[PDB]
């Protein structure tokens, strides 16, 4: 039967058939990696009375890849919370040797963007299962949530913190919990219990010795945050926002929020895919007074750029533009150097805040719900490149910012 | 686990909606439910 496919061949096949060498898909060319062990060593956390608590990573292993921040809380209301584990965390600053190297500022905002931009339906739904609790459960039910902090080294094991190579200083992150009684809306006068579990990798002596002794240079990502006031009126107003960013970036994300809850649209609800609830009509990026591209509509930034950059589009209110052709993998494939261009600008045109009862009497393409007048601010995030040099037991950044 | 548990909000239906068991709600609608 199928053998007919192999006899009826000719020159046309020369461009798809390989040589007599082992480049076939069978006779597997086996790859092998060294033996290792991993352990989740619990970290003690100092008291967090609505303040900063330091989490110090001790030398209980060779590499650390991820930090799991576990919070146990109880529901105090009939309102279903929206990522209450991420809303409770307000920021996390990671420092190496005392130098701050990575920051997540306005933390619930970045992690909701991160989840929508980076996580697939199974990973996205799972991340919700360990951060949200939404059955119609009674008030007072206690659940533990398992929040992974999206630090630069968590995405691929090979960039895990090379702690064995940092013999003269520690690594720590300062996590602050501002309040349970402000935005989640589920407070029950209950101080949540916070525990942190992190992993360690243990390598055998051949690589452990090589790794602890040799000089290393890791290309890492840094997160930069900016925000400003962004009101919207009943007419098509524009805004010209300075972009105070540095270093090569792969992409930038900007979003409009009602910073009272996790809502980026006038719908009053999360995950709205209807542009009738989103303000931005069009936007362009500008560098030193010269325009990078012709103004593209707001919907372009929420649904088209994501297809090439992520293979995944966020809900409306989250707008992304990429400079590289792949923004989730480890290899850099295109970036714009914000340290060489002196004046970076984001220019936004909005739709008119004139609409109401959107499902019935929404205008055609130039308006959005008047509820947009309750929006207060725009946040801009970008991921930049830097280099983590580890030499003679000390580490740090090559490019200071 | 996706779609087999319940919903958040705002189900738009272009066709019918058929149930076996019971429905727990009430509002204005078609010709009935208004007398």
């Amino acid at each position: 039967g199928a053998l007919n496919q192999l006899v009826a061949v000719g020159k046309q096949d020369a461009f798809i058939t390989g040589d007599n060498l082992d480049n076939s898909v069978w006779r597997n060319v086996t790859k092998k990696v060294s033996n290792f062990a991993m352990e989740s060593i619990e970290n003690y956390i100092n008291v967090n009375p609505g303040s900063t608590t330091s989490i110090v990573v001790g030398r209980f292993g060779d590499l650390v890849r991820k930090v799991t921040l576990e919070i146990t809380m109880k529901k105090g209301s009939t309102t279903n919370p929206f990522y209450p584990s991420e809303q409770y965390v307000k920021y996390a600053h990671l420092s190496i040797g005392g130098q701050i190297v990575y920051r997540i500022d306005d933390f619930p905002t970045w992690t909701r963007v991160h989840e929508e931009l980076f996580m697939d339906p199974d990973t996205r739904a799972t991340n919700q299962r360990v951060n949200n609790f939404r059955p119609e459960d009674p008030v007072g039910a206690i659940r533990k949530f398992y929040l992974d902090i999206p630090l630069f080294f968590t995405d691929d094991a090979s960039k895990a913190l090379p702690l064995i190579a940092l013999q003269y200083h520690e690594v720590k992150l300062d996590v602050l919990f501002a309040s349970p009684g402000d935005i989640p809306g589920i407070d029950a006068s209950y101080t949540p219990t916070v525990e942190c579990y992190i992993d360690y990798v243990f390598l055998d002596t051949p690589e452990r010795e090589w790794f602890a002794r040799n000089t290393h240079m890791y290309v890492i990502e840094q997160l930069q945050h900016y925000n400003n006031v962004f009101s919207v009126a009943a007419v098509e107003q524009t805004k010209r926002l300075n972009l105070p960013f540095t270093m090569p970036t792969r992409y930038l994300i900007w979003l409009l929020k009602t910073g009272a809850d996790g809502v980026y649209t006038t719908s009053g609800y999360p995950f709205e895919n209807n542009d009738s609830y989103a303000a931005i009509k069009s936007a362009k990026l500008q560098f030193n007074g010269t325009d990078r591209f012709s103004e593209r509509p707001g919907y372009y930034f929420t649904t088209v750029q994501p297809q090439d950059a992520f293979g995944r589009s966020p809900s409306a209110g989250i707008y992304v533009y990429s400079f590289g052709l792949d923004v989730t993998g480890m290899t850099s494939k295109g970036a714009l150097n914000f340290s060489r261009m002196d004046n970076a600008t984001l220019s936004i045109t909005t739709k008119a805040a004139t609409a109401a009862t959107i499902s019935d009497v929404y205008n055609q393409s130039t308006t959005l719900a008047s509820a947009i007048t309750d929006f207060t601010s725009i946040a801009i995030y970008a991921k930049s490149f830097n280099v983590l040099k580890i030499d003679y037991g000390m580490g740090g950044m090559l490019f200071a910012n | 686990p996706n779609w087999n548990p319940f919903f958040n909000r705002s189900i738009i239906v272009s066709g019918n909606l058929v149930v076996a068991g019971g429905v727990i709600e009430g509002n204005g609608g078609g010709l009935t439910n208004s007398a």
Partner: peptide, 30 residues
Amino acid sequence: PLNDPIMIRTMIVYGNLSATYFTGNGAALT
């Protein structure tokens, strides 16, 4: 997908519901 809207044994909805037609027993308000 959202194109085989068939459920077994459970359902609850928070918001409002919109539809063309309907069926089932009645324990409704007003």
